[PDB]
Amino acid sequence: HSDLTFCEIILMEMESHDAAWPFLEPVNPRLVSGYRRIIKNPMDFSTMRERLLRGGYTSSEEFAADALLVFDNCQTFNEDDSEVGKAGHIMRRFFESRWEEFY
């Protein structure tokens, strides 16, 4: 039980982070040219939240795979010095940081 509890804590702290604005909702491919073609498996914090409330995470590690997917997609699509990229680096470092001081 404590596994998914810590997932709730981490996901809530990510949802409310100052750098979280790019990842709160699915990327709108109609508005981001090329995103559909470049990113095979989109992921975002609201999709993770919907899946977590609905109970659809078996382990803490599937959760961590979805978070890492958020940041891998970010680095794949955005230059490291773009605004979304800078936000994504702050969020990724925050996630690995929080994740490790649990497990």
Which residues are at the interface with ligand JR4 (CB under 6 A)? Answer: 22-23, 27-28, 31-32, 74, 77-78, 84
Write the CA distances from 17 to 25, 75, 92, 96, integer angstroms.
Answer: 14, 19, 11, 14
With beta carbons less than 8 A apart as the criterion, state whether 11 and 49 touch. Answer: yes
For ligand JR4, the closer of residues 4 and 69 by Cβ is 69
Cα 84 to chain centroid distance, Å, stands at 13
- Smallest distance, Å, CB 28 to ligand JR4? 6
CB of 97 to ligand JR4, least distance (A): 20
Between 19 and 84, whose beta carbon lies closer to ligand JR4?
Answer: 84
